[PDB]
Amino acid sequence: GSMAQETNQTPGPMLCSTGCGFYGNPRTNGMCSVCYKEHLQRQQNSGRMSPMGTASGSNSPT
């Protein structure tokens, strides 16, 4: 293996984290075009984002 001009595969396969089978982007949230929209919609609806096991503000009046 003297020469170094043998390209077989490209590095950095930013494949969709959700597993849809399409290419994703690292500038985005690691999701493709479709999944990035659905995911952000669910995150925006929350408002109180805090990944620490528990979360404050979970009341639901009848």
Instruction: Please report, as ranges, the residues that interact with Zn ion according to CB under 5 A.
Output: 16, 18, 20, 32, 35
Based on CB atoms, which residue is closest to Zn ion, 22 or 55?
22
Based on CB atoms, which residue is closest to Zn ion, 27 or 48?
27
In residues, how long is the chain?
A: 62
Q: How far apart are CA 46 and CA 62, in angstroms?
A: 19
Q: Is 15 helix (H, G, I), strand (E, B) or coil?
A: strand
Please check if 53 is assigned to a binding site.
no
Minimal CA–CA distance to 31: which of 41, 18, 49? 18
Q: Is 23 helix (H, G, I), strand (E, B) or coil?
A: strand
Please check if 35 is assigned to a binding site.
yes
Please check if 55 is assigned to a binding site.
no
Q: Which residues are annotated as a binding site for Zn(2+)?
A: 16, 20, 32, 35
Q: Which residues are annotated as a binding site?
A: 16, 20, 32, 35
